[PDB]
Specification:
Oligomer: part of a larger assembly
Radius of gyration of chain B: 18 Å
Number of domains of chain A: 1
Radius of gyration of chain A: 16 Å
Number of helices of chain B: 2
Structural class of chain A: mainly alpha
Largest sheet of chain A: none
Distance between the termini of chain A: 48 Å
Largest interface: A-C, 12 and 5 residues
Number of helices of chain A: 10
Helix content of chain A: 40-55%
Strand content of chain A: under 5%
CATH topology of chain A: Serine Threonine Protein Phosphatase 5, Tetratricopeptide repeat
Order of helices and strands of chain B: HH
Distance between the termini of chain B: 29 Å
Strand content of chain B: under 5%
CATH architecture of chain A: Alpha Horseshoe
Number of strands of chain B: 0
CATH superfamily of chain A: Ankyrin repeat-containing domain
Chain lengths: 152, 50, 50
């Protein structure tokens, strides 16, 4: 039943396929509001996100604070799962209870690839968080000029 | 020489001093540390101090 | 507190081990029936070398 969580954690593709053939809840949430998509994107498990997407997985879900799997796949450098979640249809300007899009997360960590991808897929660069900061100010503070130029 | 010193200290000195028979180890160097070099000019520019 | 703070969910260890000043992970096992311990441990070394 709820083995999907512990399976997406360890990264078990065959077992995930088995349990989903048995009819396991794909959007099974945990005490923090995370789904197998959240975990597969936090631990970099591309096969499993592909599978779950083939079986009706909500890619714009949100935990108890407002973080979609895009936030996790962008704050870690999963350049492929980003593209997957985007193609399958994901809010690229989604916000959490703090007002943070995946742009800020990919910028703080200095991931240029994911920033370019999100901007290609329609990511608002003039966004603002609960303190009024955008990705340009993030790059300024972090002293990363490559991203600063890429944002122009 | 300072990078080699840092490696010797972090990765090797402890294991050696924690070895059978060893009673002391003197490192001929020093391990890394975040040095922050101050200039009084660039500080007075901003009316700052150490 | 909500005015100057942001919140997120992360994942982190509730217990951290270290062996001789270095981080570590402990692993426990038993040699299969009809097998010694030396050979089991030799296989563990072989597996670890990879």
């Amino acid at each position: 039943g709820k083995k999907l969580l512990e399976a997406a954690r360890a990264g078990r593709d065959d077992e995930v396929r088995i349990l989903m053939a048995n009819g396991a809840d794909v959007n099974a949430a945990d005490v923090v509001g995370w789904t197998p998509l959240h975990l597969a994107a936090y631990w970099g498990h591309l096969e499993i996100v592909e599978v779950l997407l083939k079986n009706g997985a909500d890619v714009n879900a949100y935990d108890t604070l407002g973080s979609t799997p895009l936030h996790l796949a962008a704050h870690f450098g999963h350049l492929e799962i980003v593209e997957v979640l985007l193609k399958n249809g994901a809010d690229v300007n989604a916000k959490d209870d703090n007002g943070i899009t995946p742009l800020h997360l990919a910028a703080n960590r200095g991931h240029l690839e994911i920033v370019e991808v999100l901007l290609k897929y329609g990511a608002d660069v003039n966004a603002q968080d609960k303190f009024g900061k955008t990705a340009f100010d993030i790059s300024i503070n972090n002293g990363n000029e490559d991203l600063a130029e890429i944002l122009q | 020489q300072e990078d080699i010193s840092d490696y010797v200290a972090a990765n090797m000195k402890d294991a050696i001093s924690r070895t059978s028979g060893v009673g002391d180890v003197q490192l001929f160097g020093s391990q890394y540390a975040m040095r922050i070099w101050m200039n009084p000019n660039e500080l007075n520019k901003f009316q700052l101090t150490p | 507190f909500s005015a100057f703070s942001s919140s997120r969910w992360e994942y982190g260890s509730p217990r951290l081990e270290r062996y001789n000043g270095l981080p570590s992970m402990e692993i426990l096992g038993q040699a299969a029936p009809g097998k010694s311990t030396g050979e089991a441990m030799e296989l563990m070394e072989q597996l670890a070398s990879k």
